[PDB]
Amino acid sequence: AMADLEQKVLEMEASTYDGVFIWKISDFARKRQEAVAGRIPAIFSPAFYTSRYGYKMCLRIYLNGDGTGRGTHLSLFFVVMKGPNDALLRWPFNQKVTLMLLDQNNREHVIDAFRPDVTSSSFQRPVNDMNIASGCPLFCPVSKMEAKNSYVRDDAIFIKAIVDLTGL
């Protein structure tokens, strides 16, 4: 039970309820090598929410890429998950999503954004724990991860998501 409680506590430590999320990925070099070697291709972020009782969402990253980005890019995806209040929300999910890899010199962030395709199963009301992820397979060329660059610092990177709250 203590393992389950620890998990709940970690989830709550990371949760936000205003559609803004910052994901600190520590132990970067080990996790990237794990991705390169295929042992752990992808990592899921903690869940966050659009409002106190809003959509439940998380992020999914491939540190050595997925699909068209595989082996050359960071791939970064957005996930709609089954939330506790889905019966109260409008479906399909229709909010603009902005995704960023933060420059830790705050000069040139990587940023991409999309409007949900409301005909995609990624944005319908979830029947499973999560919907199929969707996002940017070509989010960031892996070369931007080099040591001379300022996205990786002290073996960590920072990913930021901004879910637009218009109409909510």
Partner: peptide
């Protein structure tokens, strides 16, 4: 957006 493979 493109779905994860």
């Amino acid at each position: 957006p493109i779905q994860a493979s």
